[model samples]
Structures are given as C-alpha cells and as structure tokens.
Target: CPRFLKVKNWETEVVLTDTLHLKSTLETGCTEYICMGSIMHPSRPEDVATKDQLFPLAKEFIDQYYSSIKRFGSKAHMERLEEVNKEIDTTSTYQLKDTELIYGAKHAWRNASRCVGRIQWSKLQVFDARDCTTAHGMFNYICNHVKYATNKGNLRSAITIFPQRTDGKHDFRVWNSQLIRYAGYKQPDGSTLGDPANVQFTEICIQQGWKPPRGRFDVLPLLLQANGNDPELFQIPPELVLEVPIRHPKFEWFKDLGLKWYGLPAVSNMLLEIGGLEFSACPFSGWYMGTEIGVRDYCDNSRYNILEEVAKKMNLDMRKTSSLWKDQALVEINIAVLYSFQSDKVTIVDHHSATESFIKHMENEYRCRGGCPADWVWIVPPMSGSITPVFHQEMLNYRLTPSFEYQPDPWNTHVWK
Candidate 1:
C-alpha cells in the first residue's frame, strides 16, 4: 500500500500565494521582514508548513509506541500497528525504525520548549545518518557524532540524523550553527578573536578557502550541506575534538587565559520535526548548562566580551553600581565553567544542577504530559535568577509537533549562488 502511499492521479488543485510584506511597528508590537537575510531563514515563516504537525505528536507516538513496543491487544499487537502506522506516517506513509527514530528523538527532547536539559530527554543518542551523499558524507557523520558524543569524557546526548525531506532531493543541511563553533577573527584592531557569533561565519570560511589559525580558540570548519549542494567546509580532527581547558576554579592565572570549550553543544542548525518528516540535517546534542558555557558563551556582549577580561582578572571593582562586579565576574565565570567541565570528565550541567533538572522536568511533565511547555525566558538561569524554581514558573509557550526548530545562516544566503 505504499507506491509512495499510492493514490496518485494528478487531481487538479494548485493554489500558490505568498506575500507577507508586513510593516507596522509602534515599537515591537510586530513589524517584520525578519529573514535576517535568507537562504530561506524562515523564523516561523508562519511555522513553515508543508503539513502534518505530527497529529498530537502522532497520537503520542502511537500511544507511546503501543505502550512500549507490543503486547497490547495482540496479533503481534496488530503487526506493531502495521509497522508503526507505516513508519511514522501517522496514518499512512512512514518508516522510522531505529527504535522509532530513537523514541522519536527522545520524545523530541521531551517536547522541547527552550529546554533546560529536559531530564536528559530519555538519554538521547539517535544517529541515523540517513545515507549521506557528500560534504564528505556529512563529514563522516559529524566525525561519528563526535566519537559517540565525546564519550571519552562521558558526554553522550548525541543526534546526527541527516537526509529527511523527500520528493526527490534539495534538503540536507548543516551550515554550521554549531557542531562546535569558534573561529571569529576580524582583527586588524576592530577586535574579535573567537565567536563574535562566528564573525559572519568566519567570513564564509575565509571565502571558502578557509585557513585561519589567527586563533582565540579556532575550531570552526564544518559547514556541510549535502543533497542540495553548496555548503562544504569540513576540518574537524584535533584528535576528534574534546576541548575543555578554561581554568580558574581559583584562578591559577586562569590557565594563561587561552580559554576553551567544545566538548559538545553540537546543535547543527536545528529543524528535526518528526511525524511530518522534515529533518534538514538533524545534528542535535546536549550536556552543557553551566550557564550555557558560562553566561551565554563567555558572558555575551555580542559573544566573548569575557566579562571585561574576567573583570580584570578578579581584581574586581570595575567602578561599581554596588560592586556586584558583574555579579562577581559572573560567579567566577561559572566557577570556571563548572570546574572546566567537571575536570574534563565532561557532561557538564550546573546551572544549579540545571535548575534542579528543570524542576524534575516540570514534575515529570506534570506527571507524564498533563502540562509542561515551559519557556519562561528559557527556564531561567542565566545566573541564579531569584534562586530558581525556574524563576517561579509562569511558563506556557506551546507549539509542539515532533519539534526542534531554529534555522538559518547559510551564509545568511545569497549562498554562494
């Protein structure tokens, strides 16, 4: 029953209309052009729909994969619900087995809503590199999802997945928005050594010839993009990257301030979306909450302001408004990033133990899905905000589908056109 889910007869009904041209803002009430440039940047191009927002998470992943894989009202549980309703096609055309795409990417990271590490979203590890086509086969499946989520340091929450949107081709991507990033450059005195939100993608990897050791912690090569082509960067092999470094648990000259990071935040340009397919180069990851790399990647004043060089190496009193010296150099730069990722055993997580594992993942999603969509400015914790209970949860934020969005930055795109 699957000649591409049969039923093809060229029935006529083609309505194509696209025009948003909206402009009206008395100041943040809503004015939009918001593509930030484009390669189809669509920050909700009205929730870019082609369809199937996974019917209530595909009937809760088909009654939670028929109450945990088979034995419910048997006959081999109706042939495992006719092979999970045709492999994740909610009612028809589907194919997800790798244990239902690893519990549909661990319940889409336990229904992610700006996740504060949703209780290790069922300990994710997915990696179904969907038959890659190039960019060195998705950079050898992102260096084998960084050697199994950097396991040498015990980091594992991996993802990998590439290749999903079909009809013919045109979709695989990973235009680097993290499979570990760094290289910022732009020096000649305008300053920015590493991660000025990756100086325009390290000037499109030095206009694609890449070779920038002009360091501040370099490590930025990846780019990728397979089937639809164009994106190709690559480079990651310093013994398959594991980074960490950053010292200062008590500031031994903060380990000569060479500073460091990597050990996984992977995030390869989002999109995953399940039930209605749409992977667009998956690449997920987890394990890092030390104020997301110490207060948004080294105290973000547009990334790496490094709190005025860690408040002049903790001599503090930078002319105070009640010398909270930027909250004591942001709690010793998150105690030297949770003591250099727990002395490099890795799998970091201290934003007060990830806001108490996001209040035990909102009481286990209010006792298994009764309510828990959270977002209160990303389950609060940029640094002890009112002694966290996720800053007193008034959260609500919705939109669930098999999720994980946030997409853009293909050279903000005219993309090597």
Candidate 2:
C-alpha cells in the first residue's frame, strides 16, 4: 500500500490496557483499571511476583512464542508500574475519552469474535485441508518463516496447509478500517474507499487468505545460498527441519492427526535449542481457538508493541485486516466505528514520515540493504508523500538479492552459520 501515510479507518478499536493492574486485581483484589495505559511492566527482578503472576496468566491467555514475546515485551513490572502511582501516570492535558476507550474495547472484543469466523484447515496427512477454524492454521501461516517437511523421513509428502477467510464483507474488516483510521487516501486514478461518517482510518489492509508453501525441501536451500559465493550457506542446507525426527509408534490422535501437529513444536523448539537462546518460553501452534486468541491478543495487545507497530506501519491490522476473519467464512459478527475528528490538514507526507524514518534507521541499524522485508521500504515512499504506491502482489519479490555467509564473522568460524 503506497498510500502509506494517509489517514485510514479502523473498525477495530485499540483498547490499550495495563496488564499489571489486572494482575493487581487478581492478587490484591483491586479492579480499578484495565491493563494498558499508566501501568508499566518492565523486565527486572523486583517484579518477581509480577513475573510469577504472568507465568500462568500468560500461558492461559497468550498463544505462541510470538504471542509470548509480545506479551512479555510490554516489559511490565511491579515496582516500576507502581512507580506511576508514586508519581503522575497521565500526561495528556485533556482526559482521554473513556467512552472512546469503552468503544475500543467493545470493538476489539468484537473483532476478536470475527477471528472465529475465519476457516482454516488441518493437515492430517500432508495437504489435509479440512475446514479448520482460524486457530492454529492461521497462526502457523503467519509465524512460519522457513518451510518444513511433515516428516524428516518423508520430506516429499509435505504440504503447508494454510487458511484465511474473508471477502468484501466481514466484521473484522469493519474493525480493520477503524484500526488505521486516519484520513486522505486516493488510488492512482484518484479513486477512494472510505466511510467518512464511521471510519477512523481511510485505508484498507489488502492482505487476504493465508497460504504457506510446503514441499520442495530441496529448493528451500536457495535461501541459504551465500551471496559472496561462500560454500557454507550452500554447504549445509539451512537446517530446514530443526527438530530431530521423532519416531512415533502410531499416529498420535491429539498430537499428530488432531490440531496439535506434532512436527511444528519440535521444529520450533529445535530451532530455539540450536540458536541457544534458551528463551523463557516456547511458541505453540496446535489448537484453533488457542492460536487465534494468541495471535489476536498478542498482535493487538500492547505487549508486542513493536510487532504491532510494524504491522500498523504496513497498514496491516493483523487483528481485523484479513480474509480469515470475515463473513464469507460462515460467521456473522458485529463491529462498529465512530469516525470523529477527521483531520483535514494531515498530509500524506506527514503520514509516511514516521515509517520512512523508521525504515531509514532500520536499514542503517540492521545493515540490511533494505528495511522491513523490502516491500515495506518501497511502499513507504508513495505512502508518505505520493498519491500512489500500491504494489502488485505478483511483483513483490522482484529484487531480492543473495546474502553472504560471515565474512566479518563475529566468531572466526569459516561459515556464517
């Protein structure tokens, strides 16, 4: 979406909460606030109780590592959060509209309900496209980076089953419109799609159905190939299947055939093990409702603010903007938006400046040729100041380049692996 900075509408209202306050409610019987603003959760030892409280709470609510990462990323704390009580919590001169906050919560909850409308599929034995709810299937598709085989023993029979359900009509779509509720967006020919009365955002998240490619294990190595003509990346195929294959006596119903695909956790776990991060948590992708809730809460939740921000920058409201959470999927839902305070002066330049600045910094900081998966970089320009930057999906990866193994190796290892 090159119409980067334009104001868009959001059918989904962002109800920021303070998880810490919620925790206090559980422990101290205080129900004063929702866990969002004015409550800080930092990562430190003084928050041991906070940590303890979040452990099970997080497991119960959050879905996968991505979800956990974002939840924990809020960096909630006890003392630090309490410090706000010690001092002033809000700086906004005018009180934030509690009514808007109420609507935001209702909208988010409504949008979450729409996520249930999406239909995914289960990969029972390879391409098992059974009609699945927007649960693990959608979660796997979004989080899946590297492709994998159903079995290391039989990489040939692999298939990445994906699902995302949406169409011209869906409750989440309505919410999504509000999520990016800004103003002033027009297509190249000067066409526009906006509801001035009800939308907060004027843009749309064009991302539709989820489909992760599987099979061709041999081809995935292309990603591992070195740019500097180094042999290592190519030397060993990018360890595609991280988890060592488990020899199951029979297909475990719940573990294998059911929603909890046995392969993924082991794969993700194996990757984490190999990476030696020994992270605090593991990402899960087996159940449908769990996955949906996980992704919805994690992405929309203030914890994974960075990821959410990134998605927002791309005009992607993962919570409400997709095919999976729409009416075509046999689920009817409700979502409303109150488009107030339409800005007449905020130009596209102002809209794109923040994302552009972010890209410039990410490019310089990460030492990557382009920032934000390349498409983001390009879309940003037109999104910022121009009237058009809509990129054809077929033309997405037109300029991907080869990457090299470690030359300036942090470790003197021969290969960059």
Candidate 3:
C-alpha cells in the first residue's frame, strides 16, 4: 500500500512507502534545504582574515574551476593552485585570470536563484574594466558597456567589472540601483512626477549638482564613486539609452498615454562575489521581461499607478469587484508592453516564454549539479501564477558561491571624506 500526502496551496503530489521513511526523508531534506542559512550572508571579504580565510576559499574555487574543465587533479590545476596561494601570501589577495573571470561571472548568473532569465547565463559578454582608476574612466567604461549591451535594441546580457575591494574601504561603487533610471521629482501636493522608486536617489543626484528636468521619464545622471571618493555625477549619452514607446495593437489610443521605458535593464548596485574576492562595482544588463514593465513598474500602486487610468480608458466597470476591472486592465497593459517591444524590434520576453525557458534551465541545472536552488515565489509570474508551469513545481532556495549578492545602499554606508 502507498500513503499519499496532499499539501494545500502546494500543487505537487507525493507518495511514500512507509511513515518512517517519509519522516527520515523530510528531516534530511528539510535540514539540507535550510542549513545554508541566510541569503543575505556577508559578501564582503573580512579584514582580519584577509589572507588566512581567502586561501581556503580560493583553494575551493580553484578546485571547482579545474573540475569544471575535467582536470580536477591535473598537474596544471595543482600548479595554478600553488600560484594563487603564493600570490595571496604576498599581497593578502590574488588576481583571477581573464578566462577565470569570464567563467566565474557566467557561473554567478547560473547560481542566481532569484532571476528567471538564468537560461541565458552562458551567453553573457564580459567586459573587464578592472583597469579603470578614476571616476571619469569608470564613466567611459560604463558608456561602452551600455552601448554594447543595448546593441540598438537587440539587447545582450553583459557585465562590466571594476576593481575589487581592497581594505573594505576605498571601494568603487555605483550609487544608482541601475545604470539607467528615471528621475522622481516630488510635487507640492504630495505627489511624484516620475518613477517613485527612485525619488531618494534622484534627490541625491540633484544634491550632487544634477539639474532635474522634472519630467515623467527624464533619465537620471549616473552617480559613480571611485576609490571611496565622493560620488561624481555624469549624464548618460542620450543615444546610448534606447527606449520604446508603449502602444496597444488593438487600441490605437494606448500610444497617446505617452508611456515609455528604457530597453536595457542594467543593474548597477549588486556586488559580484567570485572565490573569496568581492567586486564592489560590477554593472550587469539583460533584456526586460514584459511583466516587469507592465505589472510592477506601470500598474503597481506604489509605482506609476496607471491601472485605474488604463481601466477607465478601456471602459472597465470599476464600481464592482465582480467586474474584474483590474484583471482586464492588467491583460491589456501586458499586451501593449509585448506589442510595443516587438514592434520596436527590441529584445523582450513574455512571461509564458520566460517561465518555459526557466523550466528548461532548472532541468539542465539539476542534471549537472544534482540540485538547483530556486526561489519559487520569484520564479512564478506575478499576473498568472497558476497558469505558469513553475507554479506547479517544488523548489529549494539556498545560497551558492560565485554569485551576485545585494549590498547596502552606497549612501547609507558611505563615510564622507
């Protein structure tokens, strides 16, 4: 006989031979699942254990790298390990080879459990900007990164890594959460004129001598901090920032709303951790998912809050919950987003296609690594949760090395020089 377990809100069905085996399996799996600890574990290299701790971590990474190439115990692998150890002994930190840097970056994306676009992990264009020393130099390299990644709307996944943190201080950092973000200006009537999420950063930019255009989609200047110096502001060249105007395929009035968003989504504030080293300023970009712009950025109450407006335009009955005005508006909005991007020849993915690709990525990861750490909540689409394939699946979330980690806001932790 077989015993069946049915969990509410969990779509997966499971069978067990006996109660003892079930209990053991649950205990072991659950422990291994949660034992990895917090996802926000310290990403910074320790000051005291700079050399002592880094050697063990670096050794593990070196071994993993060699094993990846099917040369785990080869002479070259052993010699490389010796070389890394010797360098660390002298300088308290070691350098990653160009090939190692590229491999490590792509692995970091593959190890990122939050992103649903990990299927394109291996296709990243790695731009090594470690030679950038001054703030202006950082700006020049960033402009190149934006141009290459944008590719005239044929977006490509890319990361430009600046120098690694040396003494935990004097680190290079990007103050903006993303390489391109719209400015937010607070009006007198307690309303925002632009993207509300960037109000604080926008204010910081203004204080740093940026003259805000005070428009709905004015691109904010880049705040680049090099060598722990006070952040300097640089306006991104307009030609490099590709944008698409939203329009509905059926409703021609949708274009009249004047809604638009940038093509490239380059996240600039994340720390890139490889081996025991931490890159404090590595900006990465990939194409957008339709719902990211449609649901979260445009429809969310805290964001643009354009749902009711769009519903009104569609003549949706807002007086009754039974009418499903929000649902109707959401569908139309997503449709417009997809239509606009496709019409403009911009690279974008709809939720259905993105989730399908994620399923394949999960399968590939499991076949190679025994298990893939996935945050099911993030993997599921925001609009149609039950309809997507990821909603029916079970996932375990855990931290893995050679990963992208969130760091504190630069302004919050900055010690003014």
Candidate 4:
C-alpha cells in the first residue's frame, strides 16, 4: 500500500448545459469558489515618525489570538464540496490535508534590491497560481519573510486573504481580509529581485524554531471539528502542480452552445482555461452560478478569485469584454491545489526537495513551453483528494539556473530537444 493513502471519495460531478444553471445557483446564494489572497501591504506611511507608534499596535493585535485565514461553512465549503465533474480517480493520490480540518493558513513575501523594500500595493500581490492548495505554500513563504521583517531596520510587507464558504462557492457576505507583512522579497521592477541579506533567521521572533519559521502555520479551526485532520500537516508541505488536460474535444460543443444561446463572434480559447485552471467573476460575485448555466455576465470566484482582483487594481486588464457572457458552458474545473511540507522544522533538505522538483517541472513544462508570466511563475503540484503538504519548496530559486544543462542527469532524453 502507499505510504499515505490509496483512494478517496467525491460528492457529485456536474455537467453544465447553459450559463443559466450556474447563474441559478449563484442567484440563490451558491458560489463555486471561496477565495484566498494576500492583502497587499498597506502603503507604508511616509511620516510614521517612530517604531513606538507601530510595534505596540502590531503586538497587541497578534496577542489576542494568532489569527486565522478564513474557512467558512456553506461558503465555498471544501468540507463537503462535491466534485461536479467527470470522475476518473477517487482513490488517494497521497494522504491529503483535511478539507475543512487544518483550517485556512496562508503566506506571502516581498524583497528588494539591497534589502526588503517598498511594495507595489497595486500589483497583483495575491497571484493567480493554477493550484488553489498551493496558495498555502505561498502563505508559508510570507510567514518566513514576516519573522525577518525588521532585518535592516525596515519592514517588507505581504498578506494572505481568503473566504470561508461551503461548496467552494463564496457569496458576497463571506469575503474578508487577514494579516499583512512588512519586509518581503524584492518584486520584479527593482534592480535585484529577491532578498538581499539572508539572516541567521533565528534572531527573528516567530522564526526561532523554524527553517522558515514554519511560515505562519495555522489551521486551528480543525481543532473545533469532531473528526479533525492531523495538526502535523502545517509542519509538512507538499509539491503541488496544477494539471490541465486538452479540451479541444469539447470545443465544438462549446461553440455551438455559445452561438445557439448567446450571440457572439466565437468563443476565445483562452490559454488560461486550457491549462487546467478555472476563472471566476468579481462583477457577478453575488450571482455566480445563479442558474444551471453560468452567464457570461456574471463573475464567479472560480474564474476570478481574489488574485483576479489584484490584476484589476494594478491595471492588468484581466477582465474580458469581447463576449457578452450572456451564458457559458457548465464545465467543472480541477484547480487542484497540490502541496507538501517539511517533516522537520529546522532542515534545508525538505525545502530543497520541493525546489528541485519545481525547477525540473518549470523548465520542463511552464517555461520550456513558453508561458513565463511577467511577474510570477507557476510550479503547481498534482493532487488526489483533499490536500497534502509536500515539502519546503516555497523559496524556489527565482534566479535558479534557467536551464538544466549542468545536471548530472538532465530531463528525459525525448524532452531535451
């Protein structure tokens, strides 16, 4: 038998007919996705004037309770989200994090040229990674940065915000924001794009017992559940990769449906959709999945999660206007959030194991095929059921070798072309 698990079970799979189906559920308060994202650090005050004005305020807030990332009931609820898609494998791919057990924990970080610097409050702070679970890995990363926020007598910032709803649907009443960081890795615009000085990491408060300080590990809500998942999950992370299958087989059906129902030139096969990901709506937040068929007019979180909001605020023009979105195909998305965590808190091996795997995958697939995002990258791992932390792979080499030429054994011979 496998070390973790051999199988799992899902609720129900849905095949969409018209946008009406999606719209109907949404109109009646049914959303398909709950969101998670970092609240871009508040623009630093120019005249803060003193640390005394800030430190005490910060400590008092965290003192109440270590805080938690939102995980709600009946709002994008993962605890009982039915797999409304065609089922193939229900068995365990690996022992995964409990659906609503570990609770919602997230992280984010930013760095600058010579040190952690000012953040682009308007940039896509919360990213649109293919895997939803992997978002937590990003959360760990932010926590690692938080412990060292005061490194150079300054603070680099980051945050992770999310929704806690049942059925993976987040209606308007459930959206919320959480923690933020002061010092993080440098973003793209600067001369150098990462942390300048690697610290002892121990001197930092929350990071003392951690390699990366367990990157703000929290899921306390699980403790409230009768059948809770293991708390050890936060200690171990996984390498999650988002996998998308070819959908040309459904192209004609989609086009015909579009022409038959909504008037339009043609359905644009956005590369984002084909990559095994789903897009949600912000405009249609209240009416997502309102009808059996989702309308093009509505914006559900599934296709436009919090990260999507990041783009708009940053002027990324992520929203599509070509079609009326009067209605659309009711297809289910995998959006699997694959992850793995470290078994030990004070080791570098666990971290590197994930990074190596990510590097291999990025060069082999994400980059080699040429979809290197401008300010972000994706190395999402795969999942079976629920979620499982892989290992420390969050701090991957943004500037790691671009190619695998120096490897003792390179990628598959057939893939080397």
List ranges where model 3 is wrong by over 4 Å.
1-49
Model 4 clash tally, residue pairs:
114
Q: Among these predicted structures, which one has the highest lDDT?
A: 3
In model 4, the Cα lDDT at residue 309 comes to 29
TM-score of each: 0.35, 0.16, 0.90, 0.16
Best model number under TM-score: 3
Q: What is the C-alpha lDDT of each candidate?
A: 0.70, 0.22, 0.85, 0.20
Per-model clash counts, in order, read: 3, 48, 0, 114
RMSD of each: 20.8, 25.3, 5.1, 26.6
lDDT of 2 by residue, 356-414 (tens): 34333333422321211222223332211232222211111111111100111111222
Per-residue lDDT tens digits for candidate 1, residues 341-400, read: 888788787777777677666655655555556556667777788776567545444445
Q: Per-residue lDDT for 161-228 in model 4, tens only? A: 22211221221110101121111222357432111221111123123233332221111100000011
Off by over 4 Å in 2: 1-34, 37-325, 330-417
Ranking by lDDT: 3, 1, 2, 4
The lowest-lDDT stretch of 10 consecutive residues in candidate 3 is: 19-28
Error of 3 at 376 (Å): 0.5
Q: Tell me the spans in candidate 4 whose CA falls farther than 4 Å from its real position.
A: 1-219, 222-349, 366-368, 374-417
